Amino acid sequence: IQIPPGLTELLQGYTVEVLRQQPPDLVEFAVEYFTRLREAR
Amino acid sequence: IPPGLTELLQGYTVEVLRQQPPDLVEFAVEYFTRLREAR
Amino acid sequence: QIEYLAKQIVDNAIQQAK
């Protein structure tokens, strides 16, 4: 299976902010995190 | 490590491996938005 | 199999974030 470049780094960056912020709702936090990151490009 | 974190990210990562999307972040926005909708 | 590969990738990313 081809492993996309940047996959581990993407998962790591989300995890670092989950550990810092301790969001009760990981799914809502993912929607917001990945939306913000798409916009930070 | 919060309960649920590894399993949540595994569903996303399975779909990335299956679907080979070109933009991982856009695929994450879509996947977790649709999971939030389903919930 | 893809599901086990995904588990390894995720678990390793979480370990690295710590």
From Swiss-Prot, chain B:
Modification after translation: Phosphorylated by the activated catalytic chain.
Q: In which tissues is it expressed?
A: Four types of regulatory chains are found: I-alpha, I-beta, II-alpha, and II-beta. Their expression varies among tissues and is in some cases constitutive and in others inducible.
The protein's name is cAMP-dependent protein kinase type II-alpha regulatory subunit
* Species this protein is from: Homo sapiens
Q: Where in the cell is it found?
A: Cytoplasm; Cell membrane
Instruction: Report which superkingdom the organism of origin falls in.
Output: Eukaryota
Oligomer and partners: The inactive form of the enzyme is composed of two regulatory chains and two catalytic chains. Activation by cAMP produces two active catalytic monomers and a regulatory dimer that binds four cAMP molecules. Interacts with AKAP4 and CBFA2T3. Interacts with the phosphorylated form of PJA2. Interacts with MYRIP. This interaction may link PKA to components of the exocytosis machinery, thus facilitating exocytosis, including insulin release. Forms a complex composed of PRKAR2A, GSK3B and GSKIP through GSKIP interaction; facilitates PKA-induced phosphorylation and regulates GSK3B activity.
Q: Which residues of the full protein are shown?
A: 6 to 44 of 404
Q: What does this protein do?
A: Regulatory subunit of the cAMP-dependent protein kinases involved in cAMP signaling in cells. Type II regulatory chains mediate membrane association by binding to anchoring proteins, including the MAP2 kinase.
Q: What is the lineage of its organism?
A: Eukaryota, Metazoa, Chordata, Craniata, Vertebrata
Family as reported in the entry's similarity comment: Belongs to the cAMP-dependent kinase regulatory chain family.
**Gene encoding it?**
PRKAR2A
